[PDB]
Amino acid sequence: QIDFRKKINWHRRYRSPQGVKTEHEILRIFESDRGRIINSPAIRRLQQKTQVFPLERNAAVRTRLTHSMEVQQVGRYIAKEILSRLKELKLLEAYGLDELTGPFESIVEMSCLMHDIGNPPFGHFGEAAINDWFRQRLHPEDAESQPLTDDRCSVAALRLRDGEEPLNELRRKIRQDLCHFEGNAQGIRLVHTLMRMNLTWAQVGGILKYTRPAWWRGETPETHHYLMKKPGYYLSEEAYIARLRKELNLALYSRFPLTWIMEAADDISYCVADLEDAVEKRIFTVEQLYHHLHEAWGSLFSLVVENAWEKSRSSTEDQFFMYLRVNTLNKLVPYAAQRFIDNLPAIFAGTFNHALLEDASECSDLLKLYKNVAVKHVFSHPDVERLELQGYRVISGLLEIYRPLLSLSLSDFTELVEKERVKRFPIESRLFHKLSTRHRLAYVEAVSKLPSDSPEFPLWEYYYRCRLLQDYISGMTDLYAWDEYRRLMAVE
Amino acid sequence: AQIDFRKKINWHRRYRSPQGVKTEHEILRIFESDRGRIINSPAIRRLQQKTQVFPLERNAAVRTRLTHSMEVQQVGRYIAKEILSRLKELKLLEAYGLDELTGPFESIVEMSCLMHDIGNPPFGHFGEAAINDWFRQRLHPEDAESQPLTDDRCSVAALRLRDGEEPLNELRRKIRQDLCHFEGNAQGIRLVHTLMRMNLTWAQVGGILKYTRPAWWRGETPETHHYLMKKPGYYLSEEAYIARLRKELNLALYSRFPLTWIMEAADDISYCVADLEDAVEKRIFTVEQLYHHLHEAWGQHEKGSLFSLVVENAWEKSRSNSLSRSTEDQFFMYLRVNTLNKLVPYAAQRFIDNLPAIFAGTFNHALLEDASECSDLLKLYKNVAVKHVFSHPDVERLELQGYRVISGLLEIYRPLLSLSLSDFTELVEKERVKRFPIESRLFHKLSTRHRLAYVEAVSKLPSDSPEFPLWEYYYRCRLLQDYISGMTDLYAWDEYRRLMAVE
Ligand SMILES: Nc1nc2c(ncn2[C@H]2C[C@H](O)[C@@H](COP(=O)(O)OP(=O)(O)OP(=O)(O)O)O2)c(=O)[nH]1
Numbered sequence: 001q002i003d004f005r006k007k008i009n010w011h012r013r014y015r016s017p018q019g020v021k022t023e024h025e026i027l028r029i030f031e032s033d034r035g036r037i038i039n040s041p042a043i044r045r046l047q048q049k050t051q052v053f054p055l056e057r058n059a060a061v062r063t064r065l066t067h068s069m070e071v072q073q074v075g076r077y078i079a080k081e082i083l084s085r086l087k088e089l090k091l092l093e094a095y096g097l098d099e100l101t102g103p104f105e106s107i108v109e110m111s112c113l114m115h116d117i118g119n120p121p122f123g124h125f126g127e128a129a130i131n132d133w134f135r136q137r138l139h140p141e142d143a144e145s146q147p148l149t150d151d152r153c154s155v156a157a158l159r160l161r162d163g164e165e166p167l168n169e170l171r172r173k174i175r176q177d178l179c180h181f182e183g184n185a186q187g188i189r190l191v192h193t194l195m196r197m198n199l200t201w202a203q204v205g206g207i208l209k210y211t212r213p214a215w216w217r218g219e220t221p222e223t224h225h226y227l228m229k230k231p232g233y234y235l236s237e238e239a240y241i242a243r244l245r246k247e248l249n250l251a252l253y254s255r256f257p258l259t260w261i262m263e264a265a266d267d268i269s270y271c272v273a274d275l276e277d278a279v280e281k282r283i284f285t286v287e288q289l290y291h292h293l294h295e296a297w298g299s300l301f302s303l304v305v306e307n308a309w310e311k312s313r314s315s316t317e318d319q320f321f322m323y324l325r326v327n328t329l330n331k332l333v334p335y336a337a338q339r340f341i342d343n344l345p346a347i348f349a350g351t352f353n354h355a356l357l358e359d360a361s362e363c364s365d366l367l368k369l370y371k372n373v374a375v376k377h378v379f380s381h382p383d384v385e386r387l388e389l390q391g392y393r394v395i396s397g398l399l400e401i402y403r404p405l406l407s408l409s410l411s412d413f414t415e416l417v418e419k420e421r422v423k424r425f426p427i428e429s430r431l432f433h434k435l436s437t438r439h440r441l442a443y444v445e446a447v448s449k450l451p452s453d454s455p456e457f458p459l460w461e462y463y464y465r466c467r468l469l470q471d472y473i474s475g476m477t478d479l480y481a482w483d484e485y486r487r488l489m490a491v492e
Numbered sequence: 493a494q495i496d497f498r499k500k501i502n503w504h505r506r507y508r509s510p511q512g513v514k515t516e517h518e519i520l521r522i523f524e525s526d527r528g529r530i531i532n533s534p535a536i537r538r539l540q541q542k543t544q545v546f547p548l549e550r551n552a553a554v555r556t557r558l559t560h561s562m563e564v565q566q567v568g569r570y571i572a573k574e575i576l577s578r579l580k581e582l583k584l585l586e587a588y589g590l591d592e593l594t595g596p597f598e599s600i601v602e603m604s605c606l607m608h609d610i611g612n613p614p615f616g617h618f619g620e621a622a623i624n625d626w627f628r629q630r631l632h633p634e635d636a637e638s639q640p641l642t643d644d645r646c647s648v649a650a651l652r653l654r655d656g657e658e659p660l661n662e663l664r665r666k667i668r669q670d671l672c673h674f675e676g677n678a679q680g681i682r683l684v685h686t687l688m689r690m691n692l693t694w695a696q697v698g699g700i701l702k703y704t705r706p707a708w709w710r711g712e713t714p715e716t717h718h719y720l721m722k723k724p725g726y727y728l729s730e731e732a733y734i735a736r737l738r739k740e741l742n743l744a745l746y747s748r749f750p751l752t753w754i755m756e757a758a759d760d761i762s763y764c765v766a767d768l769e770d771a772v773e774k775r776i777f778t779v780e781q782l783y784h785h786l787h788e789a790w791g792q793h794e795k796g797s798l799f800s801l802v803v804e805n806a807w808e809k810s811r812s813n814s815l816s817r818s819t820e821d822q823f824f825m826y827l828r829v830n831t832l833n834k835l836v837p838y839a840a841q842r843f844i845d846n847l848p849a850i851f852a853g854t855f856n857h858a859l860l861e862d863a864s865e866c867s868d869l870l871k872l873y874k875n876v877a878v879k880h881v882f883s884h885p886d887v888e889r890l891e892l893q894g895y896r897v898i899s900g901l902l903e904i905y906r907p908l909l910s911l912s913l914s915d916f917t918e919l920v921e922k923e924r925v926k927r928f929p930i931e932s933r934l935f936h937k938l939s940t941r942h943r944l945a946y947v948e949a950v951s952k953l954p955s956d957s958p959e960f961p962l963w964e965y966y967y968r969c970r971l972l973q974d975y976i977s978g979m980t981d982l983y984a985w986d987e988y989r990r991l992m993a994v995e
């Protein structure tokens with residue numbers, strides 16, 4: 001039974017609002033989420049994190065913020081058309097949506113603005129630098145089995161004892177969690193553990209795009225081969241992800257129903273907007289582009305792109321994209337809106353193992369067209385490719401810079417935590433001080449909650465120590481990471 | 493004259509507008525289409541690089557023009573929602589025509605909130621300064637205030653007051669003031685229409701006219717619209733466009749659009765407060781240091797009062813007993829919330845209270861002017877900021893550099909304003925002229941969109957006219973003011989350095 005009053009939860013993790021509440025009171029609860037997200041520095045920090053073009057110095061190219069805001073308007077159009085199209089059938093009052101029309105919209109808009117919020121300084125190359133740097137240190141490939149036997153892992157406590165323990169299972173989880181950083185998983189850690197934004201459970205579920213646990217070592221399941229594409233949460237949040245699996249009526253590895261609207265609005269706006277930037281960064285011409293599209297496929301091309309191409313020609317360039325946007329928007333937003341209503345049962349359970357755009361439909365054929373033109377003629381450009389190469393070194397150098405903090409022993413590091421300045425560790429003292437306090441309080445809070453006596457305690461302290469470091473790096477700008485790297489290499 | 497919002501919340505455009513009936517769902521769609529143009533406009537992306545109080549702030553954690561205009565967007569929402577909700581309960585809504593125009597009411601504010609500042613020049617009020625100063629040295633409007641005569645300090649020729657009329661010295665008199673009175677807002681109106689051409693819905697385009705004074709106004713203002721005409725809100729280049737806009741919305745001369753008063757409020761409130769949040773981030777002072785500046789800035793506080801409900805309230809809430817970024821990040825969203833819960837409705841009421849003078853558009857006040865213990869709160873920041881935030885020496889210095897950057901940039905392109913009409917016109921037609929190598933290449937730099945507006949507007953002239961030379965020059969300096977003003981802090985900075993051969 002599709003009852004959206006049972007999913008759109010307006011309760012919080014802390015200081016929750018309780019009991020009853022008007023249709024207007026439940027609104028103001030979600031209007032408080034808007035003010036919490038818009039005024040957040042983590043959303044401001046996006047005008048300096050990069051989307052497609054690293055460090056692009058002309059504002060006319062989209063950043064993560066201007067992109068996320070355009071996703072926000074596409075999700076509004078999709079949500080408003082699902083409410084209108086589902087109102088053509090009046091199934092709203094049958095689905096519990098008769099009094100949750102605003103929260104339906106608002107959660108999408110807000111969780112559209114908050115994807116990507118946890119992405120590291122250099123896009124898929126921050127992710128790369130981090131996982132690669134941690135694999136070389138704590139090889140998760142070796143802990144896969146049992147034993148045993150020549151364990152190539154530089155951490156002592158995390159090497160598998162030959163030596164069997166069920167505490168060797170903790171070892172296995174940690175080694176794979178830390179080597180599988182993901183913007184989506186780090187986004188959940190960001191809003192809860194690090195920012196403590198409070199927020200409604202619904203809004204916090206609207207940013208959970210993936211359901212695979214980072215520590216997942218086994219490359220399974222079929223039923224959920226798509227929703228478990230990338231990790232969506234870390235070992236450090238297994239508990240929080242459980243409290244939400246309850247609060248939103250989600251099954252294990254099941255997604256929130258409104259996440260599918262954002263994912264559609266995300267894919268829809270980056271495909272076209274990246275080609276708009278490419279022409280602005282003068283990688284090619286409006287004409288040059290058109291032929292790339294034609295050589296890439298009466299059909300849909302004529303309905304959408306050909307349509308805008310002839311309309312553009314007697315700014316022919318302004319002109320070109322204003323329509324291409326509209327034509328794509330007029331044909332793909334309704335396809336998504338209906339495809340949502342069509343598969344609503346599996347989407348409400350959050351088990352639907354496909355994306356809102358069907359590789360079958362000619363409508364999805366249009367999206368893969370836009371993405372393949374960009375992959376061949378934009379993401380392959382050499383100025384993009386080296387800024388990609390530079391960022392991988394910046395982040396990998398930052399990690400090696402701070403490696404001496406991961407080298408200390410539990411006693412020596414804990415000493416450094418309490419004694420802010422330790423005499424015999426001047427270098428580690430000053431390195432520790434560079435770590436943002438927010439990131440430091442999260443390590444303290446989580447380690448305080450541990451059993452001091454436990455034989456697993458040393459293993460958890462190191463996990464949260466490595467997670468504290470990953471929190472620092474990832475919570476950085478493209479630009480702040482580059483400056484810090486140069487400052488600390490004594491070249492600036 | 494009855495408060496009827498069917499006569500204001502229009503659904504028409506100036507170009508390729510739809511006509512006929514239109515369902516309530518059709519009217520929402522028509523304003524949601526505007527939304528897609530404003531958000532997807534490059535003119536708004538250009539804000540993540542424009543200055544907000546802090547020039548070229550190198551950490552995203554400080555606000556730009558986009559992030560500030562974004563937070564203002566949310567303050568106008570929280571006010572329309574409290575203005576209309578209070579109106580549906582009493583009486584009414586349907587008696588004002590808002591029963592079917594509820595979504596458009598919100599969307600108009602929300603969108604025209606993102607679009608203030610859209611016309612602001614690269615270096616804030618110092619772009620405004622650098623531009624008016626550089627043009628005053630050329631076209632002294634001080635001399636053409638009266639008649640004659642007698643030694644016109646005007647550096648142009650076809651613009652000196654002659655003489656010996658010519659009752660066309662009034663056109664001269666008008667232009668000599670318009671170009672010396674560029675304004676972030678008046679340039680915003682030119683921007684959405686003449687230059688960017690989004691064709692926005694007359695209602696939406698009325699929500700951005702924060703002022704009603706024409707730039708060419710050479711008078712000492714009136715007494716009724718003695719507020720709404722503090723600064724210019726439009727240029728002579730749009731005198732006609734504002735006529736048709738004043739009609740479609742049934743506005744009398746110098747009367748504001750009813751939703752603009754909401755916008756000033758969303759603006760007034762988001763900056764003053766957010767600026768102090770940044771100052772603390774920039775370590776100018778501490779959240780503690782800040783406080784002292786507030787109660788030492790307050791007056792007649794005595795005992796229980798407003799300061800206590802809002803800032804005192806947040807002061808004790810901050811010093812432990814909750815945190816999650818440790819007292820400061822805490823102090824700020826309480827101070828934000830407290831200021832918001834106790835001010836958004838107050839403003840909301842002021843709207844409903846004077847809604848006739850506010851809807852007929854004549855109310856010579858803003859929804860936060862009166863000596864109410866609530867305006868007293870705004871001035872507190874506002875005055876705390878002007879003394880200990882905007883006066884910092886690193887802020888004052890980058891303001892000085894920006895004045896030089898924009899001022900040199902105008903002097904670099906000064907050669908195009910010196911050519912004669914026939915000389916300039918030739919360079920326009922044949923994009924490349926042989927005896928003007930320097931002037932040709934300077935011309936190619938002037939981004940097209942700005943150029944098309946010069947051709948478009950001049951083509952529409954009477955070439956035979958004795959006015960034609962003077963209109964050619966107005967539209968020429970506007971083409972230059974358009975190029976400069978439509979620049980980022982950083983692009984204007986790089987251009988000055990690229991063209992001074994220092995980088
Ligand atoms: N320069 C460059 N840009 C890329 C590359 N791949 C993607 N982009 C741009 C285009 C899009 O804005 C975005 C594409 O990747 P996303 O990870 O944002 O898409 P997707 O939704 O599949 O990932 P997600 O599920 O969010 O983790 O970045 C690349 O390899 N190089």
Ligand SMILES: Nc1nc2c(ncn2[C@H]2C[C@H](O)[C@@H](COP(=O)(O)OP(=O)(O)OP(=O)(O)O)O2)c(=O)[nH]1
Pocket residue numbers: 544545546608676677702759760763764767882887
């Ligand atoms: N750095 C610096 N910032 C200033 C100064 N005066 C104002 N600001 C900043 C602080 C506020 O963000 C904002 C105040 O002016 P606005 O341009 O936003 O003014 P106003 O509310 O009069 O509306 P308007 O812009 O006239 O439409 O600009 C100054 O002297 N220095």
Ligand SMILES: [Mn+2]
Pocket residue numbers: 115116266270
């Ligand atoms: Mn995205």
Ligand SMILES: [Mn+2]
Pocket residue numbers: 608609759763
């Ligand atoms: Mn403002």
